[model samples]
Target chain A: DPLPFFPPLYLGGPEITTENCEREPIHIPGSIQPHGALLTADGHSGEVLQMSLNAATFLGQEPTVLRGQTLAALLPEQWPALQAALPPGCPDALQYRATLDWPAAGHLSLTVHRVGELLILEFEPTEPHALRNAMFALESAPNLRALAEVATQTVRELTGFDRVMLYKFAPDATGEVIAEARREGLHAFLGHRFPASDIPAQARALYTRHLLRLTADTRAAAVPLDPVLNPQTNAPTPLGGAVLRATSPMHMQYLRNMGVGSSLSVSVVVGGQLWGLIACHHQTPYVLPPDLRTTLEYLGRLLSLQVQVKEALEH
Target chain B: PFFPPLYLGGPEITTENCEREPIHIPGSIQPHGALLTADGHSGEVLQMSLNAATFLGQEPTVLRGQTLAALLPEQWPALQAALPPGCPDALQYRATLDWPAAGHLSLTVHRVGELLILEFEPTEAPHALRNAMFALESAPNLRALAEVATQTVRELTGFDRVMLYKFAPDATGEVIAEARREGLHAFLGHRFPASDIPAQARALYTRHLLRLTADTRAAAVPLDPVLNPQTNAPTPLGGAVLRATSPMHMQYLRNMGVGSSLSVSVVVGGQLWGLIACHHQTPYVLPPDLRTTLEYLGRLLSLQVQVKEALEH
Candidate 1:
């Protein structure tokens, strides 16, 4: 069967006028914001930076503790050997994890990377006992199936999503639903297969473009082009002159047909290759706020590392 | 060191066995009996036999006072330097050194029990000395490299046939790789019987990298004092005659023929890999340069064999 498409909104709506459709694209600063803190080590220079207030308070120290300190000094003595083997020239956006001892907090896990000469570090408290236990079980798995099963179960438990799947891509671009951790009463896609062309080359390429956290609602306004144009002549009459000032109609149609009101796709990179995606689907419209998405991405990076290390060791 | 008693016109001096004749020498002139000292580095000449005089074409007085280095060309100093140190007695050998008056002259040196001794026996042809060196530099792969060694040795020594006899790892007889100047028949694919070189003979070949027998008809070097007393001199001994009719090793040549032969062992990784064997229907003696060249070519063959094996595997 063909992949589903979104339903049509009012056909003769406003012709997607620029005044109605256009809004500024969000530009989030690389700097840590007030709500959350980011910490990273400049892999080349070894300097660390603290970028948020809450993280600083969590450590029970002034924000300056994170700035200008070499990561070698902050890590446990036993970890120096591991840090030395890290490939040099770390890029600003690269994400990595470090386990360190904190004086007041006892122990902390930091997700960090280089930003110019500064290292931006972020601290997240461990989850509650139940969720933490579940996550630990998932991490200790021996194979891909077990790891994906754990991820699916954890994501389902946390998001209340009806279905979560670990979708693996084959060499020819087709996909298999390798493992599924679905809520009760949810349809099973665990053994189902998907066509190669269903995603298409362009869509696969776009998967690596940005980390996507998408939510779709049937009632959301149909953003339009500026100064409504005449349909017959295909020319601007008085209002719609900007051709780029429009939301994708086909995308909306695609989501509507699938009965998927929302999706969150986190990319899994293995050995520097885009391996696959951890895909979450929802029947009801939903959006994951930035903080939640950040947390999930952190977990996704760990999953990628585990998968890569396992494959290398086995081969 | 008493001189062996000699009698003039005795049965040992017959025309048919003239080479067996022994010369009487005064006891005062007798030096060390050994050709080389304990270190195999030095020796002295007590007397020059008539054949040695004829070989050098120089009076004994002129040859007696000169060191081995003084007689040869200046370039040979490198070879002399490679000799191991510490002389217990004078070491001696008959070698051909390049001469200013002629192509090469044979002379003898007595170390007086201090330094090494050398004796040079000049030959009519000088090219043999250089040919030996050329053969030494041939490529390490014996099979593929023997052609060049054969051609160079053949041209230099004027030999009718030259074959590269590569020894098997088990110390069995050798395999021929390159041959020049074909005869009516060829031993190209034939394997020499192991009996041809018995245990004691094979041991000698390993000890002596090079062996030459100018006249197989000549009396063999006495083994009573030189070799172990219990064992008989092995077949293909230093100067054993394998054929009475041909006055050389005719039966041996016919069995594995081509007449006059010379072989230099090619060692690879410290084991004998093969030999560069030159044969001629007529008498032939490779001059010093030619002999050294063959040795160099053998080393090259060893290296080439190593390289080929590495590349193929």
Candidate 2:
């Protein structure tokens, strides 16, 4: 049989084009999971345009009703401060960040980026984790490798992922498991290196933007945006933000090959470029909100600063 | 939205993905150029860009069922004659087509999956780009040549900042020399980690040497059908002028304060040796002719470096 459709979606393979995670769109894939929520609105006026289908559960409003509502009406009393806190020339300068308590979903952190005339806001609930001990444990570590070892161990403990690794990036952008924390047998599959294709450049860029990323379930169907027109312009809004930005199908398949049900990664950015990742792999689908996302991010950043000093000292 | 050539033929291609990507069909081609795919044996046009209208002076839709005879009656015979003594599985090429109305059209014939794809591009080369090529051949050394090359490229492309980015022992990059606009900051000695340009992105350099991000924040324009309607394959966009920038790369540019950027890869020996990195403070898009010229200059630089190395040996 030849082919019924382009990409057949089901005829998944690990080819460079379709399955190469690096070349794939890991951000703004126009779809997300039902567990997460997204919203795109008019930038200046803050008038909402479109949102993830799952937003209705969190907003207590229909997707149609939610449309045209200003951020002032939607946000939980933090609209003024968030607007004020938005970095100058934003959506390009720096993604706006904050957290809100919606009672129904605990602490949902918000990240806002500009997509043409539309402001896309992403929401992911904060997952609770124990990190205070990880901090003190990190304080006890002697050198960079030991610190990384502790970081991986602490992160694995905090997230309860089956395996955690301090994955370092190569010059060619390949990945190496510099440090590993595994709960059981199957998680210890990889060797010392990914040679040079493991971490794609785009994923590294995502790491630079948002300190955290979580694929709730690799198996879930992708929820697409309605190609809704931007209120300020006729064009479909260009989308990019932290939460609910879909994972690459190639990446999903890669995870499936790796026995990963879901995963979360904390970026280690040193000297403003992506240094590496504190990657967590789960045998079962994992979930988290912004609080743990922030905490894990703090540890990753702190470790990055530490790693930077060691690298500079080497230089 | 990419289908692809062969996989490693499953589960991610890494027999050097960038170096070996089958990107015959591109996402975005220069508007001035024309793309025509034919059934390899019959020499018939199966698919083509709308720009074929300008080239053949015929409506693109009407030209669909037509043969190669309409564009160049002598093309197929010329293609077979020029088929170099090599693997039939790889691509082939035909000599340039001279047009009284247009300057010159260079044609390259390649086999992607089952189709014989013919890419017709203008042979016009800009003066500044022409100067960039000679600048490399005449310069004293790599460092000195880089500054001259950078200056000429910026002048040709009108970018705000241009640097000759070289790879060190590690994947780390160093801006050996730069030609920046007045009042702008310089990074002549800064070292960027391998992480700046990930390996996956590094792979792209092997396939497409010249890359442009007109705006760091602009939406990546996807092809209308995304995949080819006939072949059920991804439209190969390795050398396309309008391919989408990977999202993470866009974020990387934003982090570095670049509004737009372009890079011409300098592949010294099959490997990516360095690049002519041009940065802009505002959104800047390069026109096709200028972009093609820059790519030629990069090729010139690549050859020059190879000569210099051979001399040293």
Candidate 3:
């Protein structure tokens, strides 16, 4: 007789099985994609609480040396700009581009938001045209099909992905590729049906909470959080709003199975429900800058409303 | 050809039963302002509202065949220049003209088909509108946007109450934000059924952008000619500032105990989103310039509302 085999609630170890994959606590992954660095600090005290293990690569400061040090002490000259952006007690997910020369020197895109007393700051390198290059025309789509067509083409062009699909969820929770754009060599997925098991309930819930998700490189190693657990929660820090959040192992495996080197997913929510996703795939490792990702998220939100309007006309 | 005098009434137009009513071509206007339609190529006056003479010092019959250039000789050139050659039906407010009968009057010029429409009303503020626009930008969220809109409109117009009513997916509207005098009852969170504003009315609000009833008790003034020689039908006043209010709308206002009301439609994504409704307990007059400012504010704020909604989601 075997003792009850209980799958771990989190994919903390390398072993990821079918039964425990859906139950993985993906939000608090305790790791991040290697493209950027994330820092968690105290809202009032400005003391650095936790950071990605790759902080030393990006900021030239070891995680151990940065721990418990006030952000003002680390970057005395740039503290005022950072302090002004982190408005006290404001719950809105506010982000603005800031040029800061801390332990390193360059233009940085900062996303500052408050989660309880924890101040989460996401930093990434930026170029001059990153913010202004997001302009596109979506105003003239006559129907849902045309809208999806334009959406797929736009994402493919913006991200330079090999293929993009406008995936729509059916009443039975199955997904179909209603519209798709792909390179000449790629096989088309348009009109292809996918089983409901492909995207489990928890994964769909995560898509609704955060409108966009990206996996820069399927095979690249993920950088673990310096301190695996938050002292306040006694658990891994929540990465729901993190742009650098690590990819789910199950999703990575799925992408790898399809020979997908990189992938980006933008949620299409209608009436506060998870309607579908604008899914993009690349043949080689790819990354969308933070500014471009934010713009895509905004466009996705606009598309959601248009979807509601288009559906209302028929019913 | 001589035509019999025309009269417009509300005998068959009930609030809930008048969706088919052609309020745009009602063949009349509110008595507070004056209106006239002239040939676009020639300045010849084709149709004039019955109350035009009271403001312009010319008899309707006398002005019918005469040129509008002769009527307001000093200000005719500026009004003609403001006629935007390419924009056929777009309304534009030309400069104010000094009329002996009414000290100073604001002039609105527009073109409908071949007819050139000229409307006149008492002149009034751009600074207030600019400040209100700044306040709208400072608002953090959708609720704050509605609150800022109601408060700014009430402060600008000095109305008894101003409510920002937003429509739901089910066609019902809820009073999401309200700004009013302390003595009045609150309607900030009340719900109204779809029947309150019919589909036809909603379409007209989108077409007109703004509508004002200076006084619910005031009578409608009929046009001098019931039918125009050009169209062989009533002249369409859809873009006219002095367009007559539908009798059913006046009756609805009376039932609500509102003596005056101004509604500016908030359109987002080409759909009617909500309205900035200003109500007064007594008959009130809003100057033409101020009214135009409110309409501009509504159009600008619509984009802000769209942005806030996206951020909320």
Reference-based lDDT, each prediction: 0.46, 0.64, 0.74
For all candidates, what are the clash counts? 62, 16, 0
Query: Taking the tens digit of each residue's C-alpha lDDT, what string does model 2 give over B1-313?
Result: 2325332142233433433334443344544356766665566776666556777567657767777766568767655443323423222443466766567766656555545657666664312332244345545566667776888787777788999999986889999889988988889999888866766578768646777777888754333344565666666555444455655567778988998889998875457989999999888756555664675567556655654565556
Highest lDDT scorer: 3
Question: How do the residues A61-133 of candidate 2 rate in per-residue lDDT, one tens digit apiece?
Answer: 7777788578888884766755654523544323556667776777776766655455678876653113433
Kindly list the per-residue Cα lDDT of model 3 for residues B1-313, writing each as its tens digit.
1122234443355554556667677788888888888887678898888888888887657888788778778756755664535544544546577778778887777777777888888874223443354456457889888887888888788999999989998779999999999888899899998877877678778756788888999998877786777978778787776888877788889998999998888877678889988899999988876775676577657757876888877
User: What's the CA error at residue A242 for candidate 2, in Å?
Assistant: 1.9
**CAPRI-style docking class of model 1 based on DockQ:** incorrect
Question: TM-score for model 1?
Answer: 0.33
The numbered model that scores best in DockQ is: 3
Please give the range of 10 consecutive residues that has the lowest summed lDDT in model 2 chain A. A1-10
List RMSD in Å for every model shown: 31.5, 29.1, 11.7
Which of 2 and 3 is the better model by lDDT?
A: 3
Task: Compare candidates 1 and 3 on lDDT and give the better one.
Answer: 3
